[PDB]
Amino acid sequence: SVTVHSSEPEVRIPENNPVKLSCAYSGFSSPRVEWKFDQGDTTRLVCYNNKITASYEDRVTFLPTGITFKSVTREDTGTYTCMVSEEGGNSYGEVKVKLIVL
Amino acid sequence: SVTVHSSEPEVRIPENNPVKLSCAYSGFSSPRVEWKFDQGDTTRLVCYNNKITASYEDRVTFLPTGITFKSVTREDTGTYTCMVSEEGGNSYGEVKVKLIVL
Amino acid sequence: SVTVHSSEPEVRIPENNPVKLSCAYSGFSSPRVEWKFDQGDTTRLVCYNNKITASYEDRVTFLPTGITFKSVTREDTGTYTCMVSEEGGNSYGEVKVKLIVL
Amino acid sequence: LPTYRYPLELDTANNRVQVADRFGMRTGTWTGQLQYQHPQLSWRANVTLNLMKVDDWLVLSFSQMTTNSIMADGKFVINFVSGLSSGWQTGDTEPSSTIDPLSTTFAAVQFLNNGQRIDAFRIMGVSEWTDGELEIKNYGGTYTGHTQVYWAPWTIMYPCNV
Amino acid sequence: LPTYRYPLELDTANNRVQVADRFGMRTGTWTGQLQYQHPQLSWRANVTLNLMKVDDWLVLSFSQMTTNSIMADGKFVINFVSGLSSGWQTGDTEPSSTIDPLSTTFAAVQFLNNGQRIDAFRIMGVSEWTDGELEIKNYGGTYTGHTQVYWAPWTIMYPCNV
Amino acid sequence: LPTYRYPLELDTANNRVQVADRFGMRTGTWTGQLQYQHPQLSWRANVTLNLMKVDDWLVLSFSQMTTNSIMADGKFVINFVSGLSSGWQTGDTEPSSTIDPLSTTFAAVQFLNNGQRIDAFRIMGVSEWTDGELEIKNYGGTYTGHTQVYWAPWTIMYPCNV
């Protein structure tokens, strides 16, 4: 019914550089966007309800198009899962953007 | 304000035959239908919220026009009260269909 | 954003006479009116949610324009605070009508 | 132009499209027999409870009562099939889910033994609803041997739709 | 065209008719004296409780408090006539029904006697509202002789309209 | 003409515009580890709780469980970041306010010591939500030394928005 995809499903950027991870979506009346970071075992909340977490507030900026980082460390390497859900949860979509800090 | 009535207020049917008890109603914006069976002392739920009870599933079928039985027996004899209520309960109606199994 | 005012901010009336305390308001989509009486220390509820209290029911009548008393005694002397609030409390106003029973 | 369905109302005199004031409040009363069920003991007490429809919730307001002895567990059955107020349907008491418990509350009780009035609590959980029969489980709580039970007033609510 | 009434809103930049996000949340605070009433004992304690309007419900959030000794039974009075937050009316605390109780909860209490702290419960029922005065009855619960009472935080809610 | 926004819907075949029936009921399940936290003792138990969105409320339905020993005080942490149902976002568990407590229920517990099962109560309050982590403060209640804790089913809800 709806579409959730990324322009760059794999992103390789050098250390201490900015980066935007793009989340493209369509078919939603009123959507809710969520960004989760997975590095091996640890899962981290980045963005929830079109709002950035306290642990990522200082360097990440949200836009419907995606999440823009000011700088990236060796720490930030891993998968960034973007979930878009319709209010009332009748429709929802996922997309994974692999980030490789060089 | 509203109308709730039956085509056949008294119904005589032979044993093991089908029967439809008709509930006709009008004036409701969005109505809720309920069918209760009264045989002397025992009151039995037959239809609630435009849905048939577990104890009557296998043989009764609901329609806004009324409740259609596949078969009936000496057991099924008695009064069948049909209640139609408006959402928010500002208006409501009743009708009793006496069933006599022969 | 809104306006709440009185025609007569000070009212001096003789003992056992009728009196209307006027509450004029504008800018409200759907307003809620409240009247409180303050005499030195004691605060008294007169009108709440466009409805008169039990302790004032027998002699006070509410109108959007204000509160009409049938009679007044030495007891009734003091400040009458009129509060008008918008449903959802995004906007609200106050006005004080001093009443002096002579 | 579209119509409106409860709780949504269209006020004619105003061109007011609002949410019904009765949505947050719809009174009723079930008058029947409170069935206490346990395999080794079962009894029934004539009770008359109040009902309130508050948004998408159904509140039951229990009044203070004195009942026979109860086991460490047990369940309470309320047969809504008969006993409801005027204009109230048995379907008006149907929960919006099958999740168990829908809700749990504590009930303050006194275990009347000899001349003693022993204070205790009882955990009440809204369990099932089967063709008009509401099932409230008393998982337990503090307990002692007694001959009677005085229950202080209490409230339980569970999700429901109208 | 039609208009709209709270909680209904019309979004201009979108041709959006929706339900106010604040309908499910409207903060406030009553700052006053908690009146404990019983015929043989009465006292008053300076409390400052939080309030939340959640749909057609009014939540009172009690913070931990230490009070004087209380009798086996009791009443708690809250005079909303004065003490409410900015933009809050005494009428904003009126229950949508007269049913008694409108809701019941338990409070985790500590009966401070000698050096002892007795863990006990205290049932609370939202009973009356009279010209701004809410009356929370304490039907009882567990009891022992004590000089003071420490109350852990607690919540009571009751149906209400805005 | 206006579009509408959840909960406000529009029925095509009827010129309807009604409050969605799912507004008063939206099921889900968090499957994870219930974290008990205290400075001298901490443990984690595999639990699978049910969730219900009822209007502007989020209800958590705990099933009966047996856990390790607990201290007189304590915290219960629920990490919603992972474990939620299909179509459920960690943001779907965010409370609508920061007032402490939001709500405070009681849990019927049995402190398992020797061969004994000692009935007791635990007051639980909804206090914090930090980047998907819910914190339920166990303020206290009746307590004894025990080697295990059997918990009867229980419910807690707090205000939330969708």
Curated annotation (Swiss-Prot), chains A, B, C:
Post-translational modification summary for this protein: N-glycosylated.
Query: What residue stretches are annotated with the Ig-like V-type domain?
Result: 1-98
Cellular localisation: Cell junction, Tight junction; Cell membrane
Superkingdom of origin organism: Eukaryota
**Similarity comment:** Belongs to the immunoglobulin superfamily.
The record's comment about this protein's domains reads: The Ig-like V-type 2 domain is necessary and sufficient for interaction with integrin alpha-L/beta-2.
Q: How does it assemble?
A: Interacts with the ninth PDZ domain of MPDZ. Interacts with the first PDZ domain of PARD3. The association between PARD3 and PARD6B probably disrupts this interaction. Interacts with ITGAL (via I-domain). Interacts with CD151. (Microbial infection) Interacts with Mammalian reovirus sigma-1 capsid protein.
Protein known as: Junctional adhesion molecule A
Name its species. Answer: Homo sapiens (Human)
Q: Which residues of the full protein are shown?
A: 28 to 129 of 299
Curated annotation (Swiss-Prot), chains D, E, F:
Head as annotated region, ranges? 18-162
Where this protein primarily resides, as one coarse class? virion
Processing and modification events after translation: Undergoes dramatic conformational rearrangements during viral disassembly in the endocytic pathway.
Show the GO cellular component annotation of the record.
Answer: viral capsid; viral outer capsid
Keywords (A to Z) from UniProt: Capsid protein, Coiled coil, Glycoprotein, Hemagglutinin, Host-virus interaction, Outer capsid protein, Viral attachment to host cell, Virion, Virus entry into host cell
Q: Which GO terms describe its biological process?
A: cell adhesion; symbiont entry into host cell; virion attachment to host cell
Keyword Disulfide bond among record annotations: no
Question: Which residues are noted as glycosylation sites?
Answer: 46
Task: Classify the source by domain of life.
Answer: Viruses
Q: Where in the cell is it found?
A: Virion
Role of this protein: Fiber-like molecule that attaches the virion to the host cell membrane by binding to the primary receptor F11R/JAM-A and to sialic acid containing proteins (coreceptor). The interaction of sigma-1 with F11R is required for NF-kB activation and apoptosis. Binding to both sialic acid and F11R is required to induce maximal levels of apoptosis.
Subunit description:
Homotrimer. Interacts (via the head region) with human F11R.
By sequence similarity, the record places it as follows: Belongs to the orthoreovirus sigma-1 protein family.
Q: What is this protein called?
A: Outer capsid protein sigma-1
Q: Which organism is it from?
A: Reovirus type 1 (strain Lang)
Q: What is the lineage of its organism?
A: Viruses, Riboviria, Orthornavirae, Duplornaviricota, Resentoviricetes
